[PDB]
Amino acid sequence: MKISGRNKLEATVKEIVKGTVMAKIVMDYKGTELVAAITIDSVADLDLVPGDKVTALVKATEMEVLK
Amino acid sequence: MKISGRNKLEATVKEIVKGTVMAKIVMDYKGTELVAAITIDSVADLDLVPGDKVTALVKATEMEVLK
Amino acid sequence: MKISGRNKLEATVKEIVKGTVMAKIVMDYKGTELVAAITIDSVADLDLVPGDKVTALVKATEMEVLK
Amino acid sequence: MKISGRNKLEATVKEIVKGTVMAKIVMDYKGTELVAAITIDSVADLDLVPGDKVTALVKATEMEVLK
Amino acid sequence: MKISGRNKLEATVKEIVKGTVMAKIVMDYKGTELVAAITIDSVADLDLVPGDKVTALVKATEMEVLK
Amino acid sequence: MKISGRNKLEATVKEIVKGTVMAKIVMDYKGTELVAAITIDSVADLDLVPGDKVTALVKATEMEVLK
């Protein structure tokens, strides 16, 4: 299925820190570090581990611009 | 200042489409196209124009992961 | 691909209103009206039209609870 | 009060998991499971417990469409 | 009902700009200007008029900190 | 740098609660309490502590209006 969220970032998982409800997913994206905060439920469902190839997704309305 | 939003992507503005309230900011990040939807007020305040070097910003809690 | 965003609602598009930058997607979910505001770019990419069966997607961290 | 957030999902709380800062709220919505991640402060303020009839609320700009 | 969204700002509507899909709601909050981007449908549903006393609402997870 | 996020609230940190992944930042804004949920990574990066003068930041598209 196609997804409306416009920003797709093909990245690699570097580190995962699991809390009681949330998880920190640290990724590498063409040399830049990305940090996503998602539920532990999702970490389990996607079965994410360091080294995995993943797509970071961001809705256009959730992206700010700094200049 | 330092910004809590963890995701910073250094990009270049390619195109700007202005609506009555919102604006579409199309950017290039190392060959990947990004799309941000912000207010026209921000386009005016930052004086965004095609070619500008900017930083796309995304809060960690607003980034999903797909696999 | 599996998607971290935890909320998936299988819905049907009822109407689409296109602005210069954003589009209003009015959907029916088992009798409840849903409203998504996405970019016109996504309408074009997904080729969304009235009657389409789609999945409304919401990240867990973007859902409030009222009581 | 009326609320601008367009998506009101009248649901029932099924389970609550409390972390140090965040809390996972699992709900049933017209036969489909929802998962919200809110602050533990809110769980305490709303006195949320299983069986509670609540409204899951999603802003239109925070709802993606997949097809 | 009580609302999980933790940030409530009792403000006054200063200006409303209506687009095809979105509306800009400019508000005053104790001398500080606020700007919300909501759907035009919401302006009509709430029947917002400049001068009206309203509550600006922000989810805790959607608030960044700068220092 | 200028920031597209339109809502800037000059506040003071009152309390910080650190979880495994997220942190609760309790602030005072001209007598009104604010609550932000950001990553513990940001608390460390910004060296946030009670008494700090900070700017709470909210994107226009993430602010709802209630009436």
A7-26 as b/e: b if 16+ CB within 10 A: bebebebeebbebbbbbbbb
For chain D, give the DSSP string: --BS--EEEEEEEEEEEE-SSEEEEEEEETTEEEEEEEEHHHHHHHT--TT-EEEEEE-GGG-EEE-
d(CA C25, CA E39): 11
d(CA E46, CA E16): 13
| Chains with 3 or more CB pairs under 8 A to chain C | A, B, D, E
Residue E27 in tokens: 């508000």
If contacts are CB pairs under 8 Å, which of residues 27-66 in chain B contact chain C? 35, 37, 61-62, 64-66
d(CA C37, CA D4): 13
Determination technique for this PDB entry?
X-ray
Give the DSSP letter of residue E43. Answer: H
d(CA F44, CA B8): 17
What is the bridge-based pairing of β-strands D53-58 and D64-66? unpaired
Nearest-Cα distance to chain D for A30, in Å, is 26
Residue numbers in F near A17 (CB within 8 A): 20-21
Whether the Cβ atoms of residue F10 and residue B45 lie closer than 8 Å to each other: no
Phi, psi (degrees; rounded to nearest 5) at E45: -60, -45
Q: Which of A1, A17, A21 to mutate to test the interface with D (most CBs of D within 10 A)?
A: A21
- Which of A3, A22, A61 has the CB atom closest to D66's CB atom? A3
What is the bridge-based pairing of β-strands C22-29 and A7-18? unpaired
Per the DSSP assignment, residues forming a β-bridge with C8 are C57
Nearest-Cα distance to chain B for F51, in Å, is 17
Domains of chain E, first to last: 1-67 (2.40.50.100)
> For the sheet containing F53-58, what is the strand order?
E64-66, F53-58, F7-18, F22-29, F32-39
Count the neighbouring beta carbons within 10 Å of the beta carbon of residue F63.
28
Cβ pairs C/E, distance under 8 A? 39
Taking alpha carbons only, the member of B62, B38, F18 closest to residue A35 is B62
Positive or negative CA dihedral for E6, F27, B56, B63? negative
Q: Resolution of this entry in Å?
A: 1.5
d(CA F32, CA D45): 17
SS3 state of residue A45: helix
CA dist F43 → A65, B31, E65, F15, F26 (Å): 22, 32, 9, 12, 12
Nearest-Cα distance to chain F for E36, in Å, is 4
Cβ pairs B/C, distance under 8 A? 39
d(CA E3, CA C64): 7
Please judge whether B64 and A30 are an interchain contact, meaning their C-beta atoms are less than 8 angstroms apart: no
What is the bridge-based pairing of β-strands F7-18 and F53-58? antiparallel
Whether the Cβ atoms of residue E60 and residue E40 lie closer than 8 Å to each other: no
Whether the Cβ atoms of residue E8 and residue E57 lie closer than 8 Å to each other: yes
For F3-66, give the DSSP string: BS--EEEEEEEEEEEE-SSEEEEEEEETTEEEEEEEEHHHHHHHT--TT-EEEEEE-GGG-EEE
